[PDB]
Amino acid sequence: WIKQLDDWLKRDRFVFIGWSGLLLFPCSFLAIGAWFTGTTFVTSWYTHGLVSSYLEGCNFLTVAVSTPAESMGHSLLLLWGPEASGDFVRWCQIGGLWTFTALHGVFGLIGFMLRQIEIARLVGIRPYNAIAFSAPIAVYCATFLIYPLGQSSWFFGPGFGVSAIFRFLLFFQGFHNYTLNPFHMMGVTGVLGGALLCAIHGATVQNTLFRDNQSKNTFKGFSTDQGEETYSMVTANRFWSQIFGIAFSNKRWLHFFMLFVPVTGLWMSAIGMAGLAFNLRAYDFVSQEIRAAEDPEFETFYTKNILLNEGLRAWLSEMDQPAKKFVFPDEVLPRGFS
Amino acid sequence: MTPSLTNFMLSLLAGLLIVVVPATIALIFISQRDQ
Amino acid sequence: QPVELNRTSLYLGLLVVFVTGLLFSSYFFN
Amino acid sequence: QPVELNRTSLYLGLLVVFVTGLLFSSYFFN
Amino acid sequence: METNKLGFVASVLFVFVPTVFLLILYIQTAS
Amino acid sequence: METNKLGFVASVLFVFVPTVFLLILYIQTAS
Amino acid sequence: WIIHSITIPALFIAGWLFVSTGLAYDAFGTPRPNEYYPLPIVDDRYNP
Amino acid sequence: IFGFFFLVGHLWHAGRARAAAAGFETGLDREDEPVLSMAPIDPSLR
Amino acid sequence: MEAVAYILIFACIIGTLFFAIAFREPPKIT
Amino acid sequence: MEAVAYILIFACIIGTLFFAIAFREPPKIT
Amino acid sequence: RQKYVSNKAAPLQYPLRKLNSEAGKVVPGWGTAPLMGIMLIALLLFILTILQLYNGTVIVEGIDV
Amino acid sequence: FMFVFQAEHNILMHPFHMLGVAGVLGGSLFCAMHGSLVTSSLVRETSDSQSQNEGYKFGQEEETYNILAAHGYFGRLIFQYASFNNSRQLHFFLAAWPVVCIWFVALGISTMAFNLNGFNFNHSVLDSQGRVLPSWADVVNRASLGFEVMHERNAHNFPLDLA
Amino acid sequence: FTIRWLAIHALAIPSVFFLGSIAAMQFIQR
Amino acid sequence: GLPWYRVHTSVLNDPGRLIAVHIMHNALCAGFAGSMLLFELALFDPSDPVLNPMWRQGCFLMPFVSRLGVVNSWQGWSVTGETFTNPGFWTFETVAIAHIIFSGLSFLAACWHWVYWDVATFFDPKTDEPVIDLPKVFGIHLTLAGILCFGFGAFHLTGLFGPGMWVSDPLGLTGHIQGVAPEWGAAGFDPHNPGGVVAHHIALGIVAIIGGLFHIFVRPPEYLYKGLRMGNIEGTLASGLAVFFSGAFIAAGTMWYGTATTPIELWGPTRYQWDQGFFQQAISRQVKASISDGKSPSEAWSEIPTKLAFYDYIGNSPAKGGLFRVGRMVDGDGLPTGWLGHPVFKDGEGRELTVRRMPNFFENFPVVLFDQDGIVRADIPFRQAESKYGIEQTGVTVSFYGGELDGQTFSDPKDVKKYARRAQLGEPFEFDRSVYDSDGLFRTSNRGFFAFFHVIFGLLWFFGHIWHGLRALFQDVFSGIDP
Ligand code: CLA
Ligand code: CLA
Numbered sequence A: 001w002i003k004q005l006d007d008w009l010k011r012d013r014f015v016f017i018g019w020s021g022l023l024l025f026p027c028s029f030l031a032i033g034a035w036f037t038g039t040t041f042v043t044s045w046y047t048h049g050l051v052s053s054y055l056e057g058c059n060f061l062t063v064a065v066s067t068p069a070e071s072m073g074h075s076l077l078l079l080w081g082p083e084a085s086g087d088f089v090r091w092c093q094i095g096g097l098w099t100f101t102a103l104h105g106v107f108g109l110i111g112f113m114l115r116q117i118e119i120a121r122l123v124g125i126r127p128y129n130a131i132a133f134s135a136p137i138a139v140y141c142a143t144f145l146i147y148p149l150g151q152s153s154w155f156f157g158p159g160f161g162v163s164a165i166f167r168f169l170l171f172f173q174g175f176h177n178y179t180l181n182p183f184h185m186m187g188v189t190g191v192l193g194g195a196l197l198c199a200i201h202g203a204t205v206q207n208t209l210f211r212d213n214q215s216k217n218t219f220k221g222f223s224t225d226q227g228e229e230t231y232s233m234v235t236a237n238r239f240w241s242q243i244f245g246i247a248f249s250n251k252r253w254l255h256f257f258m259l260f261v262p263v264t265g266l267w268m269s270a271i272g273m274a275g276l277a278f279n280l281r282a283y284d285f286v287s288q289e290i291r292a293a294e295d296p297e298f299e300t301f302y303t304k305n306i307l308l309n310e311g312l313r314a315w316l317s318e319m320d321q322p323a324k325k326f327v328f329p330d331e332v333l334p335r336g337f338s
Numbered sequence B: 001m002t003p004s005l006t007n008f009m010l011s012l013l014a015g016l017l018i019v020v021v022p023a024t025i026a027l028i029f030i031s032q033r034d035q
Numbered sequence C, D: 001q002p003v004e005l006n007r008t009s010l011y012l013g014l015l016v017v018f019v020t021g022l023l024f025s026s027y028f029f030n
Numbered sequence E, F: 001m002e003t004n005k006l007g008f009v010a011s012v013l014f015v016f017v018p019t020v021f022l023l024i025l026y027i028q029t030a031s
Numbered sequence G: 001w002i003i004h005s006i007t008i009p010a011l012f013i014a015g016w017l018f019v020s021t022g023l024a025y026d027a028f029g030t031p032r033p034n035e036y037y038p039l040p041i042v043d044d045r046y047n048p
Numbered sequence H: 001i002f003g004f005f006f007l008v009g010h011l012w013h014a015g016r017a018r019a020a021a022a023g024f025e026t027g028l029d030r031e032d033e034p035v036l037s038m039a040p041i042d043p044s045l046r
Numbered sequence I, J: 001m002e003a004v005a006y007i008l009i010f011a012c013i014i015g016t017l018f019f020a021i022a023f024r025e026p027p028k029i030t
Numbered sequence K: 001r002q003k004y005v006s007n008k009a010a011p012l013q014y015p016l017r018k019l020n021s022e023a024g025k026v027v028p029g030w031g032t033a034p035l036m037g038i039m040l041i042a043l044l045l046f047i048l049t050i051l052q053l054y055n056g057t058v059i060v061e062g063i064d065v
Numbered sequence L: 001f002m003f004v005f006q007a008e009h010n011i012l013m014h015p016f017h018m019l020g021v022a023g024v025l026g027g028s029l030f031c032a033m034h035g036s037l038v039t040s041s042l043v044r045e046t047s048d049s050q051s052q053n054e055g056y057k058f059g060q061e062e063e064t065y066n067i068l069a070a071h072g073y074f075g076r077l078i079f080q081y082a083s084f085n086n087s088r089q090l091h092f093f094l095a096a097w098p099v100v101c102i103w104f105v106a107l108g109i110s111t112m113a114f115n116l117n118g119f120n121f122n123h124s125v126l127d128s129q130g131r132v133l134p135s136w137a138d139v140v141n142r143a144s145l146g147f148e149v150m151h152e153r154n155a156h157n158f159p160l161d162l163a
Numbered sequence M: 001f002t003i004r005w006l007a008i009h010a011l012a013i014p015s016v017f018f019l020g021s022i023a024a025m026q027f028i029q030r
Numbered sequence N: 001g002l003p004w005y006r007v008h009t010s011v012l013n014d015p016g017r018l019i020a021v022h023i024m025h026n027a028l029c030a031g032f033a034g035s036m037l038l039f040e041l042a043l044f045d046p047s048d049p050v051l052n053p054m055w056r057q058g059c060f061l062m063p064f065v066s067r068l069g070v071v072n073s074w075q076g077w078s079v080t081g082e083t084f085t086n087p088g089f090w091t092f093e094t095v096a097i098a099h100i101i102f103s104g105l106s107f108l109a110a111c112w113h114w115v116y117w118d119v120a121t122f123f124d125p126k127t128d129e130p131v132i133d134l135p136k137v138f139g140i141h142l143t144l145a146g147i148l149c150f151g152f153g154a155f156h157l158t159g160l161f162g163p164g165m166w167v168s169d170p171l172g173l174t175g176h177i178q179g180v181a182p183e184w185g186a187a188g189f190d191p192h193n194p195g196g197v198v199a200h201h202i203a204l205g206i207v208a209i210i211g212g213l214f215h216i217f218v219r220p221p222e223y224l225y226k227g228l229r230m231g232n233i234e235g236t237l238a239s240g241l242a243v244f245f246s247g248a249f250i251a252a253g254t255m256w257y258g259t260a261t262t263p264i265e266l267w268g269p270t271r272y273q274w275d276q277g278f279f280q281q282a283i284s285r286q287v288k289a290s291i292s293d294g295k296s297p298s299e300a301w302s303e304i305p306t307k308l309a310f311y312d313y314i315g316n317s318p319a320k321g322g323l324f325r326v327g328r329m330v331d332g333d334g335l336p337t338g339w340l341g342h343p344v345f346k347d348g349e350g351r352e353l354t355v356r357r358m359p360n361f362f363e364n365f366p367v368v369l370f371d372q373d374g375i376v377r378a379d380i381p382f383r384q385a386e387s388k389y390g391i392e393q394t395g396v397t398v399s400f401y402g403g404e405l406d407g408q409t410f411s412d413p414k415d416v417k418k419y420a421r422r423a424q425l426g427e428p429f430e431f432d433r434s435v436y437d438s439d440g441l442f443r444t445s446n447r448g449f450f451a452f453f454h455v456i457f458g459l460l461w462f463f464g465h466i467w468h469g470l471r472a473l474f475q476d477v478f479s480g481i482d483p
């Protein structure tokens, strides 16, 4: 009885369901769906004072499922919750679709990692892809959940749209000085090195191929069934040893490195965001904020970044958070003497 | 029994009849005939 | 089995230590 | 032949280092 | 420069306490 | 106490720079 | 192309007429092109 | 943009022309691989 | 003394880079 | 900080003394 | 090891092995797991309601939120 | 340089830079993905108390992993006609994705060198009377203007910072 | 009514509706 | 066991050595607790709990020690404030010395268990392979945890045979230690209710005693034994790591949000007490109650306690420090020497002006003075060439009520321009940055540092949980799949 359903879900179809597909397909379909519902139809006028739908007039770059109203706090904003009282429209005007999307997305991400584990167990391979997927989930939980929980409200989370993310990026520089954050520097290093490794390994394989065909199109020199290497690891090791000084000699270590580099970068950036939830910032170097203030001649690129951050902060915040009602007169706004 | 608690219990009692066992009583029917 | 650390792992470990220390030195000094 | 240092030599070396350092610490501090 | 004093001693033990560990592990592997 | 400042860092490298050497030599002997 | 002859039309026209009749603006509370400045950020939680 | 793509395309055809005339533009010969007939680069190896 | 730490650590990266090119473990074919 | 060095070094002598009694290399008869 | 230490070196050796003696024994079939499933849904309901109650989604008289 | 460039050119709204971001983040995705797949379907050659990297011998001719098993896993993960069966095509894609996208983002820097900046959507959504409804691009402008009026402070004698 | 008929329609019965709505939005005068 | 990252698996099939290496982690943990508290007390300033509490001084372990019952030292003093002569036996030192002695005993016991690994407890009677019965051991352990929970919450927190726990008023001024009756109703789920904590521990002690008794006499089902890899101790590690990272997130959240367990006399205020102006509204409400009690403005404003005014410093928000601004809070703004009094800014037209306080987000903030209407009336300019507003152009005067400047009025542009900077940081205070060589840049409290560290701990223990769950399930294919 109970075994029949297990045998059902483990079947070979066009899309594998599995047991994880109960916690993945009902959530992901909602989260993805609530984005398309949001970015087509609902406004951010009552949460943000901005327009963020195709119905407003926005395009794909400037639509978002923006974060909830700043007065909603860290409320879950359930549809039946007190802030909507079951009323659908009042739930969409206060940014309840952001919480719908974010919660269904984190459950979809859990369901997808469970799916990766389940399919590895069914087929019988190691679960390294789920381990590698723990880095996007660490980043998702840091950016969309841990950061707004550490802040005032869900409002300061990232909106589910392109330009909302661009605002989030510039907000993080101006208010957080996030480029100066070393955990983010390791994140950048990990991601850039992951892209370097991807490119260099693909081109190295493609240029150390064996003559396993007769045509000039070398893409037909490989069969799925063959048990032999399609590219010379010896020639590749020789080339990179005499170009770069070092080379891989172990194929398994190479492909573990290709796993390890972007995953650990992405995890280190998640650590940096976890720090920015509590405002624990690598904002400044105390020695240089001191020296530049005892010496009106000491200019470094860092001091010019601190000035740029103040310029961003004062010239964004009056329309970034409109619940705060920041009033800055034109003559306290830091200008650079236009 | 504040309204914000009545809706909480009602969401329990409704979503049990939305995804918990509309889907399970359908999984039984669809697992008996795709054995 | 006894523990190993081959030469390549030693060089990799030395660089990751040395570069990570160079990165975090500026912030330990503040 | 490779270098050795047996356990007894390690303990003797540790004590001679540690006691000599304790002796000369008072004079390094001055 | 008003820098952290212990920032020197934090920098050098951060980078040579692991380093000697690696050399210990390497040397015992090589012998 | 008007003591030598570097007398601390002289004391600890005098007594652990040789010490790690001995441990290196011991560990590679034991393995 | 038989059972979907009008099925694809009926659905597409349904979405078109959902926008065109103005039901979308009332469906999601979206401000119409002249309800923006007759600006109201909601300032309270339990009663928006 | 045109200068950059055409410098890339020139590098492509320069490498490919050299390799096609040489006789190794379809891959490494499994029968004889040039690195296998080269002396080691490491100074200790004799 | 803050530049001294940076220069010493950079010298450590450079020494590791030299020793990992010059005195690298030879890759033997099987 | 001058007493700290003395107490740390004395703890190092005490640790060496414990480990050279407790975890000593066994003397085997031939 | 096949030889254990003397009872003089470890007095509580055999008195505490009786507890570590049926390692691997199970009950056949699904066991008492049907009650375990009821508790896995009840404790998840408890965690959900206590989170909603902390969060102020559930405002019952008694919680200042 | 990044901040001043955003202030003066709005690179975030430049499509070549969106391609560059897709390239670097997707190259990291594909690097982690390809590495986890080859690592996950390794042929058993070693014991559990030794590194799996000892299963490969430098210059061994035999394939050290199972393309079939990694392929079957990836295909079950998304759909059937998605997983590269072929490996030569697979590594051409690994080469091509970040290389082509970094080509495009280098080209984006280069056309912004001639002041051909990114997309501009300021004052683009108007209400019935004509009032500008702010969008998210407007908020990005407002932050870029923040950066814009603080860079090279004692060096713009006229209000128009040209190139 | 099968599994094939639901995993190709729950994604596409809404999608055509959305596309029809968005095509109507290209003709809205605001 | 051969790769460096696998070496501790040499005890994975050796439960006597496993117990040894656990007792050594215990010795290190307790020795760290003892030594850290000794270091926290060598650096502690107990002179005043009003302006130099432990949360301003970077005290990490001291709040946790004093939250249960140990508030007074053998030196006489107490973190509540009173000096006496007979501070019981359980002082701040006795606790650290107990942990140091425990650490020494545990080091010796770990030495014994490393040497005497081959005892017939860890090998079953029928064969001689090393095994530990995880369901039985789990039941025994769950029962032990149940008695400890039940007892701690029903005898130490109630105070029946225990010190009690720290309770406080909402304003956080009357912080003391007393035994708390349990709260079984809905009121027990109030986060700022200590009877809820007491009732939680009682109820969960009964629950864990019953579950432990059920996990000692009932063997696991044969499907769940192989399903959850119950013979694999690694699987136990994975589930424990799950409990460990989700507790870390809950602990970090309840430290950042503030519960009855983290009161503000020990960990200081939260950032959310500054965000909503909690102490600001409290003081305004108290002041106006005194004003309507026939008292003068200066007389009402001088009954505000210095401890109640100090909570309105944004320098005491834990969301205002930095990642690498290391150390204690008084390493930043400095040592507070006194409350300057409530500043009341008045323009040249005789209008009540209020300086916009700065939020937690801003490293620096434009000083802009509003009025009852909320229109800008003065500010500290930047462009100063079309600046229609401004202190000296409008002639803004600051007059203080309460504190050290009670009755004083300032009208100099320099002085008003300075006190309008201190007014946006909350209640103005005088800071001596000479005692601690304070650099002037704000630092987070022990509340902020604990929350941030235990969030990092939650994240890495999430990964460690995943790593060991995947290793426990996929044990058969770790070396590789199949030829
Ligand atoms: C009637 C008796 C009684 C009373 C009055 C209480 C009262 C309380 N219990 Mg409880 N309890 C009882 C009986 C009782 N209990 C019994 C019989 C059991 C056995 C099941 C329990 C088991 C239990 C647990 C496991 C917990 C409580 C907790 C609590 C406190 C909740 C308030 C709080 O701080 O939120 C705190 C926690 C929550 C509101 C739930 C958080 C769960 C999160 C949302 C899960 C998801 C987070 C994820 C893992 C990490 C996030 C990652 C990223 C996305 C942020 C409260 C005072 C909680 C507590 O003590 O917190 C410190 C708690 O965790 N109790
Ligand atoms: C209760 C916690 C716990 C325990 C008991 C273990 C136990 C184990 N882990 Mg593990 N792990 C954990 C948490 C834990 N882990 C967490 C939280 C993570 C994510 C950060 C990991 C990620 C992880 C990986 C990737 C691996 C293991 C492995 C192992 C096994 C080999 C032991 C080893 O690595 O030694 C070797 C370690 C060293 C020789 C030096 C490491 C030095 C560290 C980096 C610095 C030490 C910091 C400090 C001194 C420790 C204090 C921590 C503090 C925050 C509390 C062992 C059974 C390995 C395995 O699977 O076995 C085959 C393996 O590859 N773990």
Ligand SMILES: CCCCCCCCCCCCCCCC(=O)OC[C@H](CO[C@@H]1O[C@H](CS(=O)(=O)O)[C@@H](O)[C@H](O)[C@H]1O)OC(=O)CCCCCCCCCCCCCCC
Pocket: C007, C010, C014, H044, I011, I012, I014, I015, I016, I019, I022, I023, I024, I025, I026
């Ligand atoms: C600048 C200060 C900062 C220093 C930074 C540098 C860090 C280096 C860390 C250690 C890296 C080397 C590990 C071992 C490599 C190897 O085995 O090489 C072995 C080689 C021989 O090559 C080999 O020889 C082997 C046979 S044999 O050695 O010739 O017998 C053969 O097996 C092998 O294939 C062949 O390659 O030679 C050596 O013996 C190297 C050991 C030297 C010790 C490390 C250098 C110490 C610093 C020197 C400068 C002093 C600085 C003074 C100022 C403070």
Ligand SMILES: CCCCCCCCCCCCCCCC(=O)OC[C@H](CO[C@@H]1O[C@H](CS(=O)(=O)O)[C@@H](O)[C@H](O)[C@H]1O)OC(=O)CCCCCCCCCCCCCCC
Pocket: D007, D010, D014, J011, J012, J014, J015, J016, J019, J022, J023, J024, J025, J026, N114
């Ligand atoms: C207090 C801080 C200052 C520390 C001062 C102490 C310095 C010690 C230096 C090293 C001396 C020991 C060398 C090796 C001895 C030996 O092999 O023992 C082997 C023995 C087993 O005995 C043995 O066991 C062997 C077999 S086996 O190990 O059991 O497998 C067997 O062959 C042998 O006969 C038997 O005797 O056990 C060990 O593994 C000892 C290694 C522990 C590492 C050194 C201690 C590290 C400090 C611990 C406290 C941390 C301090 C934290 C605060 C900073």
Ligand SMILES: CC1=C(/C=C/C(C)=C/C=C/C(C)=C/C=C/C=C(C)/C=C/C=C(C)/C=C/C2=C(C)CCCC2(C)C)C(C)(C)CCC1
Pocket: N028, N029, N030, N031, N032, N035, N100, N101, N102, N103, N104, N105, N107, N108
């Ligand atoms: C012998 C003996 C004794 C004694 C004892 C003692 C005296 C002790 C002690 C102890 C101690 C004194 C301890 C301790 C500890 C500590 C610890 C254990 C710690 C730590 C740390 C850590 C872990 C950290 C790490 C790190 C750092 C450095 C920072 C950050 C990063 C990292 C993480 C890396 C007696 C007589 C009693 C008895 C008999 C025996």
Ligand SMILES: [Cl-]
Pocket: A304, A305, A308, L004, L150, L151, L152
């Ligand atoms: Cl600039």
